[PDB]
Ligand binder design. Structure first.
Ligand SMILES: CCCCC/C=C/C/C=C/C/C=C/C/C=C/CCCC(=O)OC[C@H](COP(=O)(O)O[C@H]1[C@H](O)[C@H](O)[C@H](OP(=O)(O)O)[C@@H](OP(=O)(O)O)[C@@H]1O)OC(=O)CCCCCCCCCCCCCCCCC
Ligand SMILES: OC(Cn1cncn1)(Cn1cncn1)c1ccc(F)cc1F
Length: 1335
């Protein structure tokens, strides 16, 4: 373990120094070989000497002195708009004091502790000391100095010497401790003149020395880890944070609750590390702690006590107790001094001494007045004034290395991070390769005739898209590494711009690999121009396109906070760019209001360049001459003409240049200009991204058990976890259950309540009044978990009412349930915040309120037998733990039987329990019985069986733990299990259990048939309640429904008004088909938005509501499925109204007088599409754990469905292999139904550019020459007054609809098929969730 720089640590440092000085080999106190060499002096000298000393003033230590310091500071979805308007009006155009006058001085090498109750201003004080005043202001009368410097000097020039870090250890999970510390050592090492010593080896030696100092040498080559990623222990992560902070050159270090959620054995090591840093490296550590042990308190040098923002004492930690006792306060026996000082601000505690009850401060003002009047304050003020006088009498860039060095080190660290977790690049490259192969399969081997003119247009449109979004997932790397970048900026290590540049540079190999793997396959599987130069130009254009898109995505993400948050507004922009690339709406078809968008579209130029490269200067063999068929068997080719935009009469080949000029209006003079435009766009977006990164940042029945033995299978070997345990509980008694780490107290608690998912019971038996456990036991107990798992939107009253309704017997009327909920609220003292939203931990109920709500949720269910509590007091400050203990005592007084597991309690807390069950290592009970007054009886047990007498001022818990040798460094005289087995107290317990079993059995039973039911409420009631709760939670979510509405409305309006009043020419029909195709894009964003709110509900249900048997899994999954339907239906209605009418599709129904039926069918189709989106998202999420994986799988399946939906290529051109994917596609039928409903049964009028000139034979007219063909195939013609006929190949939209395999007579059937698919999804969900999650 860590014992704070013992002799062997000095030996290790001496060996390291010997190795370092021998490596560079190729006074007495600094020679590792010479005797009388002290590691402390070597470590101190390493930082200053053995490196060049810049002429700039750089302090090696800091201390802060200040006087007169004062700091002060100033919903559903319907009302969200009103709240936003009010907030904006407030933005357009009293004082609540936090910290009152304070005076203090902290010198280097002294560890300081800020004591006080929560909300007393300790965190604010430590923020002020660390020049972190953001969010409030300090008074102008306050005199603050840092060894003669100024707060603004520290803020701007000397940033990084003073650091603040409170509760979150932000590290890279997959980076080893050695690498993490080497990075800081390298970045903090000055360069200047490196002659005489290598910088790399010096940094390595410094990192190794600091690892040795903080006892982290054994953690080298081990991943730092995280709460999710496994790595070093939680107590080692804190020491890693300390080592990194001290290695970067921080002198003043402020921590708030950095030890929160740590056991005493590890909090003590944290304080020991802080003390070691203070004494060896002359740092100034300040810590704000709420649960401090006596051993930890013995390490503090100075203490500052805060009472509602008033500093009531500052001085040596060994004199606070005497000062406050002289004030007239009595310290209760067996109370740690830290707890005494903290409780001296609690009216419930803080009992005055006898005779001092009349003259003692009672309010914060009186305490402050006493402190000011005391001689200690006078001495402190004199010392601070002298320090100020001494300081008065006697670097633009806080960073150390140059920008190039910062970029280089960032690139190296990013490469190391990729090496540690190489899953993402490999997955991205393989996905790109596979999806490019699949996409090229449909476009395989495009022919050389004009029949490919469309497909060659589509392929090049989908190549660019594939290159555009290939780097979309890299944005994730921005969000993961953001907190670490902010921390290292606050440490004055490197700038955010340097990290951005390093991130851009590091993924260039990945970008190149993806580009090669996709383009090389695609350009050749899809038959494009085979010229090597053409391929290389295409590759260059794709490379520049992907650079532009990557920079744009990075710019968008630099000002975001979440993937869905960035995708909601960015989806509209990306859809607009995709639409105006130049293929969906060719330039001739673009409207006047939107022709400007194409000018500022970075992808339109790429598409134009690629199309020019492929088509210009190319001749395509004609595939279909318009006059042909049975009536035209032998005619001259002079009369015929090709069916293409640029076709020339009498020509057997069509030139690519004419087709490009006519259809798209692309020209070869723009082939290279577009490259320059794209390069300029890339540079502009890169500059914007860097600028944003730099700037935009910042109970009659009795339950007992006998001989309970419990074993589990570990490494294919049986292990005994519980060894013949026995005991009981009785109404009105609290039975603490304690033991060592390996005592298995938690295992005993879980096994008693039947919450263990493994193991078997061998010898024991659990009884209720002597009767075995029936099926009604699980519903006759309450269980309060350590963690508080509640929905963030439900109110306290609603949270209690849900449980009361779903867990109480049905015969009880709703009024009785509400009355009991009110009674429980009154009992637990929640009337003040009965209607308050639970909210998140940071904003909402505090820890005590959340724990009270957790207890109440179980109480309202009316447990009849027992109330298990899993560590109720753990993870709470002394006062909140005291309050919870008093609440438990009150509950016991009311007739409840309580059995609680207790971990590391204080003497006062332990004195409140009625009975104790103490477990040794291996589940062996050492003591079971009443602990008497002040734990006296328990003390009277061990002392009477050969144990050292308990100290008069020691905590009984710690003493009894160390008597049995459980505590580290403690020696047990003998195993106390055998002592307990034959002690005349085990005999009493056995006799009592036997008497209870023999006697209580005679009592008449209370056999209630409803008790023997798995769930209290019927299935339909559970389903209805769960669905309504989910609907309300979605409605009250802050910005979810509005996000969906905004995304859908914007996308639908843009799509509708891009094709506003679309004309029915030959190109207009294709444009409208691709409009329908693009109507489905918001699928991915909707799924991503919706999944997290399913994650939250699933977590809440499975963690707590599943074992409690509140409702069945079916009522959960069906409720989740039903919750989303109404919102999707409303969204689909809005989208249909925003898209159908702007396109003017109703005009296609006027000729046949079928406006209403077709409109109704289209509305149903759109709403069904949205419902299908929701069902598919839920299906893909059912069997997966993480939401990101479910979203990715849904996107992949949607892409596969869209590829083979019949738009890009019909079944005739699709390879026979993929035909099944064309039939099993839910989207083929949807697209066919939509197209047939919106386009069928109307006329077609060709545009001027689409008419093909036909020269009739000499001595013939247009009609007499073209009528037989018109009878064969549709179309019409016009006379151009020149002798030629302008022919249009299509006269009715039915021809195009048949070309796309869409029929107007099969719309309804198609619709039905789509509905079937929706049904399937739902069914699959209800099955998959059972297979993957239900146990
Ligand atoms: C960290 C960032 C990393 C980014 C990656 C870095 C990338 C840097 C690359 C720098 C390389 C720059 C090369 C520029 C030199 C162009 C010289 C041709 C200029 C020209 O102009 O060549 C026109 C004809 C086609 O022209 P065309 O068929 O469309 O029409 C004309 C005819 O070519 C004809 O020649 C007559 O014109 P000229 O006599 O030439 O003036 C007239 O004929 P007609 O009008 O009567 O038909 C017409 O103008 O190019 C052709 O064939 C094919 C010729 C190769 C096309 C580009 C070269 C390939 C790129 C290099 C490598 C690709 C990426 C590199 C690796 C990627 C990742 C590692
Ligand atoms: O990524 C695609 C293009 N694509 C890639 N392989 C096959 N088609 C598919 N896609 C992704 N989500 C939905 N469809 C795309 C990207 C953006 C876009 F606007 C359309 C579009 F088809």
């Amino acid at each position: 373990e860590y014992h704070g720089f013992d002799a062997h640590t000095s030996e290790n440092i001496q060996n390291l120094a010997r190795t370092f000085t021998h490596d560079s080999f190729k006074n007495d106190q600094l020679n590792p070989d010479s005797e009388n060499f002290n590691a402390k002096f070597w470590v101190k000298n390493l930082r200053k000497l053995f490196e060049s000393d810049p002429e700039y003033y750089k302090p090696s230590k800091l201390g802060i002195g200040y006087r007169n310091l004062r700091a002060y500071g100033v919903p559903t979805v319907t009302n969200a708009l009103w709240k936003l308007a009010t907030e904006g009006f407030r933005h357009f155009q009293r004082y609540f004091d936090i910290l009152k006058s304070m005076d203090a001085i902290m010198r280097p090498g002294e560890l300081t502790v800020v004591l006080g109750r929560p909300g007393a201003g300790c965190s604010t004080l430590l923020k002020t000391i660390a020049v972190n005043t953001y969010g409030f202001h300090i008074g102008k009368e306050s005199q603050i100095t840092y060894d003669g410097l100024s707060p603004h000097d520290i803020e701007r020039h000397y940033r990084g010497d003073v650091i603040y870090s409170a509760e979150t250890d932000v590290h890279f999970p997959h980076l080893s401790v050695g690498d993490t510390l080497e990075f800081a050592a390298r970045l903090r090492t000055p360069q200047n003149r490196g002659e005489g010593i290598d910088r790399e080896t010096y940094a390595k030696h410094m990192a190794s020395v600091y690892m040795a100092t903080y006892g982290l040498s054994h953690t080298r080559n081990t991943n730092v880890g995280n709460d999710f990623v496994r790595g070093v222990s939680g107590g080692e992560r804190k020491r890693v944070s300390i080592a990194e902070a001290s290695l970067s050159g921080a002198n003043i270090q402020c921590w708030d609750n950095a030890t929160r959620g740590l056991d005493s054995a590890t909090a003590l090591e944290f304080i020991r590390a802080l003390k070691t840093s203070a004494v060896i490296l002359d740092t100034t550590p300040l810590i704000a702690i709420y649960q401090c042990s006596q051993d930890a308190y013995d390490l503090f040098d100075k203490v500052v006590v805060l009472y509602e923002g008033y500093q009531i004492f500052f001085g040596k930690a060994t004199k606070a107790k005497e000062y406050f006792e002289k004030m007239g306060w009595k310290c209760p026996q067996r109370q740690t001094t830290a707890d005494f000082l903290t409780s001296l601000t609690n009216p419930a505690e803080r009992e005055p001494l006898p005779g001092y009850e009349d003259k003692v401060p009672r309010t914060a003002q009186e305490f402050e007045t006493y402190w000011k009047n005391s001689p200690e304050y006078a001495e402190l003020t004199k010392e601070i004034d002298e320090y100020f006088v001494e300081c008065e009498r006697s670097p633009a860039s806080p960073y150390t290395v140059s920008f190039f060095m910062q970029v280089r080190y960032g690139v190296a660290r990013n490469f190391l991070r990729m090496k540690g977790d190489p899953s993402i690049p490999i997955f991205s490259v393989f996905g790109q390769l596979v999806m490019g192969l699949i996409l090229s399969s449909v476009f395989y081997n495009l022919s050389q005739t004009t029949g490919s003119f469309y497909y060659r247009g589509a392929a090049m449109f989908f190549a660019v898209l594939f290159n555009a979004f290939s780097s979309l997932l890299e944005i994730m790397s921005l969000f993961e590494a953001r907190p670490i970048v902010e921390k290292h900026k606050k440490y004055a290590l490197y700038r955010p711009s340097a990290d951005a540049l390093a991130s851009i540079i590091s993924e260039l190999p990945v970008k190149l690999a993806m580009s090669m793997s996709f383009n090389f396959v695609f350009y050749f599987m899809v038959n494009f121009r085979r010229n090597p130069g053409r391929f290389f130009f295409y590759w260059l254009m794709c490379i520049w396109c992907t650079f532009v898109m990557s920079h744009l995505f990075r710019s968008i993400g630099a000002v975001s906070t979440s993937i869905s948050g960035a995708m909601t507004p960015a989806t509209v922009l990306l859809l607009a760019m995709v639409i105006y690339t130049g293929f969906v709406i060719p330039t001739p078809s673009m409207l006047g209001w939107s022709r400007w968008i194409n000018y500022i579209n970075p992808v339109g130029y790429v598409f134009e360049s690629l199309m020019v490269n492929e088509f210009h200067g190319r001749e395509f063999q004609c595939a279909q001459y318009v006059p042909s068929g049975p009536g035209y068997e032998n005619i001259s080719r002079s009369n015929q003409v090709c069916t293409a935009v640029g076709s020339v009469p009498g020509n057997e080949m069509v030139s690519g240049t004419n087709y490009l000029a006519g259809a798209y209006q692309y020209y070869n003079s723009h082939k290279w200009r577009n490259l320059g435009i794209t390069i300029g766009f890339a540079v502009f977006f890169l500059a914007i991204y860097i600028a944003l990164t730099e700037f935009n940042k910042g109970n009659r029945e009795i339950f007992f058990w006998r001989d309970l033995t419990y074993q589990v299978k570990i490494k294919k070997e049986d292990r005994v976890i519980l060894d013949h345990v026995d005991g009981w509980v009785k109404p009105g008694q609290i039975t603490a259950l304690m033991g060592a780490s390996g005592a298995g107290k938690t295992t005993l608690l879980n096994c008693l309540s039947e919450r263990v998912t493994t193991g078997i019971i061998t010898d024991g038996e659990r009884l209720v009044n002597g009767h075995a456990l029936d099926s009604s036991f699980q519903r006759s107990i309450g269980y309060v978990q350590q963690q508080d798992v509640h929905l963030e939107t439900t109110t306290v009253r609603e949270a209690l009412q849900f449980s009361a309704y779903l867990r109480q017997s049905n015969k009880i009327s709703k009024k009785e349930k509400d009355d009991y909920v009110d009674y429980v609220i009154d009992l637990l003292e929640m009337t003040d915040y009965a209607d308050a939203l639970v909210g998140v931990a940071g904003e909402g109920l505090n820890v005590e309120q959340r724990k009270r709500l957790t207890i109440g949720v179980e109480l309202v269910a009316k447990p009849k037998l027992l109330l298990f509590l899993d560590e109720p007091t753990s993870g709470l400050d002394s006062q909140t733990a005291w309050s919870i203990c008093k609440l438990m005592r009150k509950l016991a007084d009311h007739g409840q039987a309580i059995l609680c597991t207790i971990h590391q309690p204080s003497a006062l807390i332990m004195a409140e329990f009625d009975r104790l069950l103490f477990l040794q290592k291996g589940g062996r009970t050492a003591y079971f019985g009443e602990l008497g007054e002040n734990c006296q009886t328990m003390i009277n047990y061990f002392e009477k069986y050969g144990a050292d007498p308990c100290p008069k001022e020691a905590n009984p818990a710690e003493w009894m733990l160390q008597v049995v040798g459980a505590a580290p460094g403690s020696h047990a005289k003998q195993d106390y299990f055998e002592v307990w087995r034959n002690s005349s107290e085990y005999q009493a317990v056995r006799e009592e259990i036997n008497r209870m079993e023999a006697e209580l059995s005679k009592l008449p039973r209370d056999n209630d048939p409803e008790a023997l039911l798995k769930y209290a409420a019927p299935l339909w009631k559970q389903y209805l309640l769960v669905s309504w709760r989910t609907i309300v939670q979605d409605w009250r979510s802050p910005g979810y429904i509005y996000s969906k509405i905004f995304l859908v409305v914007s996308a639908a309006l843009f799509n509708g008004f891009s094709f506003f009043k679309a004309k029915n020419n030959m190109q207009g029909l294709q444009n409208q088909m691709f409009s329908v195709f693009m109507f489905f894009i918001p699928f991915n964003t909707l799924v991503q938005q919706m999944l997290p709110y399913f994650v939250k509900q699933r977590d809440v249900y499975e963690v707590r509501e599943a074992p409690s048997r509140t409702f069945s899994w079916f009522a959960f999954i069906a409720g989740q499925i039903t919750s989303e339907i109404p919102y999707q239906v409303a969204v689909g209605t809005i989208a249909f109204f925003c898209w159908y009418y702007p396109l003017g599709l109703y005009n296609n129904a006027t000729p046949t007088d079928s406006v209403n039926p077709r409109g109704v069918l289209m509305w149903m189709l759109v709403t069904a599409f949205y419902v299908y989106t929701a069902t598919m998202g839920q299906l893909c999420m059912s069997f997966s754990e993480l939401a990101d994986n479910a979203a990715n799988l849904a996107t992949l399946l949607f892409t596969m469905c869209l590829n083979f939906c019949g738009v890009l290529a019909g079944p005739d051109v699709l390879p026979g292999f993929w035909i099944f994917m064309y039939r099993c596609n839910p989207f083929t039928y949807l697209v066919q139904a939509m197209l047939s409903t919106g386009l069928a049964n109307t006329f077609v009028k060709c545009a001027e550019r689409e008419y093909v000139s036909v020269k009739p034979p000499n001595g013939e007219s247009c009609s007499t020459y073209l009528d037989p063909y018109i009878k064969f195939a549709g179309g019409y013609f016009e006379t151009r007054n020149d002798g030629s006929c302008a022919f249009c190949q299509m006269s009715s939209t039915n021809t195009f609809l048949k070309s796309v395999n869409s029929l107007y007579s099969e719309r309804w059937r198609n619709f039905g098929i789509f509905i079937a698919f929706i049904a399937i999804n739902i069914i699959l969900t209800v099955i998959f969730y059972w297979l993957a999650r239900v146990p």
